[PDB]
Design a protein around this motif. Structure first.
Motif, PDB file in Angstrom:
ATOM      1  N   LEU A  95       0.869  -1.173   0.000  1.00 31.81           N
ATOM      2  CA  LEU A  95       0.000   0.000   0.000  1.00 31.81           C
ATOM      3  C   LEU A  95       0.908   1.226   0.000  1.00 31.81           C
ATOM      4  O   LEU A  95       1.457   1.606   1.041  1.00 31.81           O
ATOM      5  N   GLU A  96       1.067   1.835  -1.171  1.00 36.24           N
ATOM      6  CA  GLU A  96       1.958   2.963  -1.385  1.00 36.24           C
ATOM      7  C   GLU A  96       1.171   4.255  -1.558  1.00 36.24           C
ATOM      8  O   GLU A  96      -0.013   4.253  -1.908  1.00 36.24           O
ATOM      9  N   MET A  97       1.865   5.365  -1.321  1.00 35.41           N
ATOM     10  CA  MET A  97       1.393   6.697  -1.671  1.00 35.41           C
ATOM     11  C   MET A  97       2.417   7.328  -2.602  1.00 35.41           C
ATOM     12  O   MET A  97       3.619   7.301  -2.319  1.00 35.41           O
ATOM     13  N   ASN A  98       1.941   7.892  -3.707  1.00 31.49           N
ATOM     14  CA  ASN A  98       2.782   8.370  -4.793  1.00 31.49           C
ATOM     15  C   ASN A  98       2.810   9.896  -4.807  1.00 31.49           C
ATOM     16  O   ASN A  98       1.987  10.562  -4.172  1.00 31.49           O
ATOM     17  N   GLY A 164      -4.871  -1.960  -7.731  1.00 30.15           N
ATOM     18  CA  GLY A 164      -5.389  -0.750  -8.336  1.00 30.15           C
ATOM     19  C   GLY A 164      -4.751   0.494  -7.759  1.00 30.15           C
ATOM     20  O   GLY A 164      -3.935   0.439  -6.840  1.00 30.15           O
ATOM     21  N   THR A 165      -5.153   1.631  -8.330  1.00 31.39           N
ATOM     22  CA  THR A 165      -4.625   2.936  -7.956  1.00 31.39           C
ATOM     23  C   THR A 165      -5.771   3.931  -7.825  1.00 31.39           C
ATOM     24  O   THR A 165      -6.803   3.799  -8.487  1.00 31.39           O
ATOM     25  N   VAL A 166      -5.580   4.934  -6.965  1.00 31.66           N
ATOM     26  CA  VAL A 166      -6.593   5.956  -6.698  1.00 31.66           C
ATOM     27  C   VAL A 166      -5.902   7.306  -6.543  1.00 31.66           C
ATOM     28  O   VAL A 166      -4.910   7.416  -5.821  1.00 31.66           O
ATOM     29  N   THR A 172      -1.373   9.781  -5.017  1.00 31.15           N
ATOM     30  CA  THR A 172      -2.062   8.611  -5.544  1.00 31.15           C
ATOM     31  C   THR A 172      -1.660   7.379  -4.747  1.00 31.15           C
ATOM     32  O   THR A 172      -0.471   7.137  -4.512  1.00 31.15           O
ATOM     33  N   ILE A 173      -2.658   6.625  -4.328  1.00 25.23           N
ATOM     34  CA  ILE A 173      -2.517   5.386  -3.580  1.00 25.23           C
ATOM     35  C   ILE A 173      -2.384   4.230  -4.560  1.00 25.23           C
ATOM     36  O   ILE A 173      -3.115   4.155  -5.559  1.00 25.23           O
ATOM     37  N   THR A 174      -1.451   3.323  -4.273  1.00 30.86           N
ATOM     38  CA  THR A 174      -1.207   2.150  -5.105  1.00 30.86           C
ATOM     39  C   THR A 174      -1.294   0.904  -4.238  1.00 30.86           C
ATOM     40  O   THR A 174      -0.505   0.741  -3.304  1.00 30.86           O
ATOM     41  N   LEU A 175      -2.243   0.028  -4.548  1.00 34.57           N
ATOM     42  CA  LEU A 175      -2.391  -1.248  -3.864  1.00 34.57           C
ATOM     43  C   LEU A 175      -1.992  -2.354  -4.831  1.00 34.57           C
ATOM     44  O   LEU A 175      -2.577  -2.473  -5.918  1.00 34.57           O
TER      45      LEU A 175
END
Lengths: 180, 205
Positions: A95-98, A164-166, A172-175
């Motif tokens: 679970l990343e934040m971009n 997915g990404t949001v 932007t969050i990357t799961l």
């Protein structure tokens, strides 16, 4: 701060909590069944019925220690297996934040995070570790931490399925999932 | 500019239903929300969607679907009609299509036009098996293939940017199916078609 980001940090916090909830529950060896409701409670985050396991919540907050994913600091959920002899890292959910900021974006983020949680519900059941976990010989292991994402413990030749990404005004969050 | 996605699966006969149900539900898991309860002021509250796991009898596979037992029959019955058509068609190859559209009001007398924004087609290839070992091996390999299918559906659910905007109260049946008690899917229709298998050109090769 502006209240919109109070709500946004709240949304990100509870999205992380529910993410850990969905993964761990998808590795518990039994089927999950929750009911829909037209008169919901005030605790149905992202319009989904995801029951919180208090122990999983306590380990998730203790791992979180009161902070959110950011550029460089990401939340990871490691699912492993220890044989009767004794440690295979089966999958690490990331679970990343971009860096990129969606400036053209209050509740659009909430709905996109809901959809991302639904995608997580789908993906957690089609990786090999799922049907490994449904037949448990073997006992499944979970461990939540901040990364510093440590990939090496899986093995060579891993592949990453992107849940997915949001996009959010803060990033932007990357799961995703790196699995053996 | 309606987006289209094509899938294809090779299954034993008794695997069609579940296979189809795994794709449809997966898509419908992403293309639905909680039921809207509108207030006279124009605001609305969104209900809660339940999800549950379905183990497959004839496949080594499990999929997540919304907890709406009327949607599950709206799917199982049309999949049963497609399964009937396949057997009646003989030794030939079929497909099912799931379209998401919205209604657009047109001036009298014209009927309101249904504009599709997304369409999901899955082609079914049926193989006949001869031994029990083939049946077991098929049960596992179809599960692995379906894992790949669900993964690709999920990735498409990110590569697709457009979604209809939220309707107001009188606008709600132009965008959503409001006939169910436990879930509110986007307006959709499922049709099917028995294909004529065609040839491959000996040009690019």
């Amino acid at each position: 701060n502006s209240q919109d980001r109070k709500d946004l940090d709240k949304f990100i916090k509870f999205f992380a909590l529910k993410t850990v909830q969905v993964i761990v529950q998808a590795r518990l060896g039994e089927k999950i069944c929750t009911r829909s409701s037209s008169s919901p409670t005030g605790s149905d985050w992202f319009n989904l019925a995801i029951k919180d396991i208090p122990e999983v919540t306590h380990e998730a907050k203790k791992a979180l220690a009161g902070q959110l994913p950011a550029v460089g600091r990401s939340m990871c959920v490691e699912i492993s297996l220890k044989t009767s002899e004794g440690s295979m890292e089966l999958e690490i959910w990331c679970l990343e934040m971009n860096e990129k900021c969606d400036k053209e974006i209050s509740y659009t983020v909430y709905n996109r995070l809901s959809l991302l949680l639904k995608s997580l519900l789908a993906i957690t059941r089609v990786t090999p570790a799922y049907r490994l976990s449904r037949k448990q010989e073997y006992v499944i292991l979970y461990r939540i931490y901040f990364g510093e994402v440590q990939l090496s413990g899986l093995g060579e030749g891993f592949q990453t399925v992107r849940v997915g990404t949001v996009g959010t005004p803060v990033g932007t969050i990357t799961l995703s999932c790196a699995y053996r | 500019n309606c987006r289209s996605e094509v899938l294809e699966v090779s299954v034993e006969g008794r695997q069609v239903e579940e296979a189809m149900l795994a794709v449809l539900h997966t898509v419908l898991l992403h293309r639905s929300t909680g039921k809207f309860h509108y207030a006279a002021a124009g605001t609305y509250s969104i209900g809660t969607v339940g999800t549950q796991d379905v183990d497959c009898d004839f496949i080594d596979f499990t999929y997540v679907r919304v907890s709406s037992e009327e949607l599950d029959r709206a799917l199982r019955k049309v999949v049963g009609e497609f399964k009937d058509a396949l057997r009646n068609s003989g030794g030939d190859l079929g497909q099912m299509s799931l379209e998401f559209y919205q209604k657009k009001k047109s001036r009298w007398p014209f009927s309101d036009e249904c504009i599709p924004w997304e369409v999901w087609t899955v082609k079914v290839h049926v193989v006949a098996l001869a031994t029990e070992q083939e049946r077991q091996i098929c049960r596992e390999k179809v599960g692995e293939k379906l894992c790949e299918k669900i993964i690709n559906i999920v990735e498409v659910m990110n590569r697709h940017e457009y979604l209809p905007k939220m309707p107001t109260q009188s606008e709600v049946d132009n965008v959503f199916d409001t006939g169910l008690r436990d879930v509110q899917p986007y307006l959709y229709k499922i049709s099917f078609q028995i294909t004529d298998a065609l040839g491959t050109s000996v040009t690019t090769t």
